[PDB]
């Protein structure tokens, strides 16, 4: 209970926490057995009379940066101020709260960019009250287009059921693009693993560490998802009908699969960390192999040439019959045989 | 009653009494002057700047009425913050942390607060204190403390302490920004030293701030009537502020643990480059000084005639070999 007192603010202040203030929109989809509408607008007061509608309603408010709209919707729909503070707190983990009239779910969607490997996270909130579902996002572009198309073109069961099936459809779409993201990260991790062994540079290290951190984020945001789907499936609060629980069970199994996949990826990147060091050691080995080969072949020749090239007053071997060619021949023989000796193994 | 604090030279007693309309300030060292302050129905605050002297703390404990064990906890300095409720008085344990920007170290000093009837005892360790704002607030009446009892005084003390926590967090935030900029721009072993010391400071801050949460929780959630219902909501605010501290602390650790990893992996990637340098130079100059020694053989058997610039021919062959080796290194991309 109570809205937490953040110091440095006026008491009871609702503040947006994220960073996206570019866009703001409201989109309404009122669908029934026979007829439907799509009332996309900006005047919040026009959306309100849908709270008491008989047919299921899907309200989608993008751009929660406008806290006045969120406060007005929460007040008219009878939503507790703590729920609103959770809505506007983007920095969070997926969670579920069951109330006497509405069910409040916090989920996360993710996007991945190529040529700029950033795992961008956008928090989306769902509030299922009566026969309506409120939806809160903070940027244009989501993964619920299949649901909109199914509703618009009357394909599937969604037009036949209540709003609980709508909430199930939304969560199913979220799990689907989770799978899509896992496939994209699979491709990226394969590319990075192949590259780290052939061109090991510091940018490979930076990319691998960024991938590892992204995977830690993914794990920390997927296990709460397992928890919330479990909470939706087992206890089945009164707002959710008893016939719609197998769907949530399927979504629960999907989340199990996603957790397994992210754990596998985490193990793979943990392996790539040691693989990089092994590869750089291999490169240093090649460089010093060249250095040690030239050293071994041409230092003994150098000191023997120095020894015969000395200023003793004696006359040991300075007038022998072509002694210089003999020295060069035997010396080249020893160099050739030691190069042959080094030709074993992978040194040469 | 053994004293373990590391501050011994400092000692002073100061009393601030106040009513709806009047206040009085008192400063002394002899405890005889602060004994008769029970009779003041209006709330009063007595501060013992130095607690090294066991005699004064023992006398004040036996005078106002203080359990032997909580008094021994007062004298003890290495103690986790705690709250104890007695019918006569309540006892609370707090910490103050000063952190110098230039001289990087996060120190501490222990405070004990005892609230019996209207007199609030504070047992400071040494000089250098934070609660100047509450002293100025009660000196110049621009608040609500005048209309409430010593309970609001305790609340004001704790609120000032959490404000000092916020200021320390701002300082640590500046240090973290500077450290991140240094790591991204230019690493160093002293940079690693800074990262490690900052990590340790964050760890100790988390360890010491977490008990304060349950301190405040005990102070409002199921509080006895000695802290008064009207005063209860105020403590709530303090609790909320505590949460922020904790939250901030954790995210700072989340940003300092991963700061150093790229440098940890990046070492031994200069090893290969220094091999590149040494190997190219050795490759150039091993055969070159080799043939230098070969031509310095002093054999004299093979004719060393002037020829067609024989010595320049030797130098030209040397330069050709050097150019060939440079081409080979370019091909190897070393």
């Amino acid at each position: 209970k109570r809205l937490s007192a953040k110091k440095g603010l006026p008491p009871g202040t609702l503040v947006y926490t994220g960073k996206y203030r570019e866009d703001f929109e409201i989109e309404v989809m009122n669908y029934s057995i026979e007829e439907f509408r799509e009332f996309k607008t900006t005047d919040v007061e026009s959306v309100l009379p849908f709270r008491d509608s008989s047919t299921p309603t899907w309200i989608n408010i993008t751009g929660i940066h406008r806290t006045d709209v969120v406060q007005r919707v929460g007040e008219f729909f009878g939503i507790h101020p703590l729920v609103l503070e959770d809505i506007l707190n983007v920095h969070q983990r997926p969670k579920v709260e069951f109330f006497e009239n509405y069910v409040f779910i916090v989920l996360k969607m993710f996007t991945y960019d190529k040529n700029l490997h950033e795992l961008e996270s956008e928090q989306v909130s769902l509030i299922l009250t009566k026969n309506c579902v409120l939806m809160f996002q903070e940027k244009i572009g989501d993964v619920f287009d299949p649901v909109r198309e199914r509703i618009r073109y009357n394909r599937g069961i969604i037009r036949k059921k209540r709003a609980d099936y709508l909430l199930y459809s939304l969560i199913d779409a979220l799990v689907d693009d989770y799978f899509v993201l896992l496939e994209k990260i699979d491709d990226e991790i394969d590319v990075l693993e192949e590259e780290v062994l052939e061109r090991p540079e510091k940018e490979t290290v930076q990319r691998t560490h960024q991938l590892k951190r992204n995977l830690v984020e993914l794990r920390k945001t997927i296990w709460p998802l397992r928890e919330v789907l479990s909470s939706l499936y087992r206890d089945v609060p009164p707002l959710i009908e008893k016939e719609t629980v197998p769907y949530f069970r399927d979504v629960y199994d999907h989340t199990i699969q996603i957790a397994d996949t992210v754990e596998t990826f985490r193990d793979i990147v943990s392996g790539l960390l040691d693989v990089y060091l092994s590869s750089v050691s291999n490169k240093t080995n090649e460089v010093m192999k060249v250095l040690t080969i030239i050293a071994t072949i041409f230092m003994p020749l150098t000191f023997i040439a120095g020894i015969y090239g000395m200023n003793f007053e004696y006359m040991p071997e300075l007038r022998w019959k072509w002694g210089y060619p003999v020295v060069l021949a035997v010396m080249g023989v020893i160099a050739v045989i030691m190069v042959v000796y080094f030709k074993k193994k992978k040194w040469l | 009653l053994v004293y373990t604090g590391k501050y011994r030279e400092d000692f002073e007693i100061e009393v601030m009494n106040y009513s709806i309309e009047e206040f009085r300030e008192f400063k002394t060292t002899d405890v005889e002057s602060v004994l008769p302050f029970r009779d003041s129905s209006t709330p009063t605050w007595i501060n013992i700047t130095g607690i090294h002297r066991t005699d004064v703390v023992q006398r004040v404990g036996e005078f106002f009425g203080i359990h032997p064990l909580v008094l021994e906890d007062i004298l003890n300095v290495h103690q986790r913050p705690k709250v104890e409720f007695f019918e006569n008085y309540v006892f609370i344990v707090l910490k103050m942390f000063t952190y110098d920007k230039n001289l990087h170290e996060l120190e501490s000093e222990q405070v004990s607060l005892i609230l019996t009837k209207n007199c609030v005892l504070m047992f400071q360790e040494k000089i250098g204190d934070v609660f100047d704002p509450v002293r100025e607030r009660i000196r110049y009446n621009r608040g609500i403390i005048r209309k409430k009892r010593a309970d609001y005084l305790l609340y004001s003390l704790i609120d000032a302490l959490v404000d000092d926590y916020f200021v320390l967090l701002e300082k640590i935030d500046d240090e973290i920004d500077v450290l991140e900029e240094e790591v991204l721009e230019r690493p160093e072993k002293e940079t690693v030293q800074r990262t490690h010391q900052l990590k340790r400071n964050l760890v100790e801050l988390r360890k010491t701030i977490w008990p304060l949460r349950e301190v405040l929780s005990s102070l409002y959630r199921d509080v006895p009537p000695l802290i008064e219902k009207e005063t209860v909501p105020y403590f709530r605010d303090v609790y909320d502020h505590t949460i922020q501290i904790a939250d901030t602390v954790e995210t700072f650790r989340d940003i300092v643990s991963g700061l150093l990893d790229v440098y940890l992996s990046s070492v031994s990637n200069k090893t290969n480059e220094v091999m590149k340098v040494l190997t190219i130079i050795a490759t150039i100059f091993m055969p070159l000084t080799f043939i230098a020694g070969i031509y310095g053989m002093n054999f004299e058997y093979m004719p060393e005639l002037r020829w067609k610039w024989g010595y320049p021919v030797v130098l030209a062959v040397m330069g050709v070999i050097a150019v060939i080796m440079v081409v080979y290194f370019k091909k190897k991309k070393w």
Partner: antibody, heavy 123, light 106 residues
Framework: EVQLVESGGGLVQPGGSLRLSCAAS????????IHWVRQAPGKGLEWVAS????????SYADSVKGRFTISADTSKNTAYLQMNSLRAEDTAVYYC???????????????????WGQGTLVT | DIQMTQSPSSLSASVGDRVTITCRAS??????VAWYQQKPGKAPKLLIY???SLYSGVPSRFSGSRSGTDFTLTISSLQPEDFATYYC?????????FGQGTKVEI
């Protein structure tokens, strides 16, 4: 759409009393904090007052603390500033601005003024 | 008390060249600073908030940087419509303090 206007600037002898009214359109003054800022000719901007009409939160400038009085009435959806015992230096252009809070860290919040009123003149 | 000194007092530069205005705070401010543009006789406009975050609907030539307790407003490519006075801000405390005000001309 979201427009702030000011009224009440005029030729008033120093030491007098007057009232500046900031009328708001396109939004609700209840859900945002309204700031009053003063800029002198040849000088930079200088924040004066801040009101959070949702609560009693009221913060005046350091220089003129306790000499002004800011509030807001939601029936007209406007903010009010009461100026009493003016000085000679108070002659300047007054701007009324909305401001929203934003999040930096868990302990520290900031705020920014996104819409600025045209700003009356006081002498 | 807290104050924000903005340097330089004024700057003159051509069109299409980088312009940098630095700003220092008496007491450490976390990140709550802002940069504004004020045409003469007109209301100020909000350019940068959070010390690094570009406003919604404003050209990206303006950029913000933070180093320690110092903040820099930088311009990638100055324009003729960019000759005005730029200020700092503080939002750490309920007492908001503005910068000196640096005017950029041709």
């Amino acid at each position: 759409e979201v427009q702030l206007v000011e009224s009440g600037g005029g030729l008033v002898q120093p030491g007098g009393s007057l009232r500046l009214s900031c009328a708001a359109s396109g939004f609700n003054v209840s859900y945002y904090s309204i700031h009053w800022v003063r800029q002198a000719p040849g000088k930079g901007l200088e924040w004066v007052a801040s009101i959070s009409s949702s609560s009693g939160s009221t913060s005046y400038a350091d220089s003129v603390k306790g000499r002004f009085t800011i509030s807001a009435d939601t029936s007209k959806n406007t903010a009010y500033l009461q100026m009493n015992s003016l000085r000679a230096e108070d002659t300047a252009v007054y701007y009324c601005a909305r401001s929203y809070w934003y999040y930096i860290w868990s302990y520290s919040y900031g705020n920014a003024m996104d819409y600025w009123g045209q700003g009356t003149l006081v002498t | 008390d807290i104050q924000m000194t903005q340097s330089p007092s004024s700057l003159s530069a051509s069109v299409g060249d980088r312009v940098t205005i630095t700003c220092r705070a008496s007491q450490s401010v976390s990140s709550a600073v802002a940069w504004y543009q004020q045409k003469p006789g007109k209301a100020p406009k909000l350019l940068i908030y959070s010390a690094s975050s570009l406003y919604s609907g404003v050209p990206s030539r303006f950029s913000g940087s933070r180093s320690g307790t110092d903040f820099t407003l930088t311009i990638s490519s100055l324009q003729p419509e960019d000759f005005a006075t730029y200020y700092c801000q503080q939002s750490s405390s309920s007492l908001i303090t503005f910068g000196q005000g640096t005017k950029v001309e041709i």
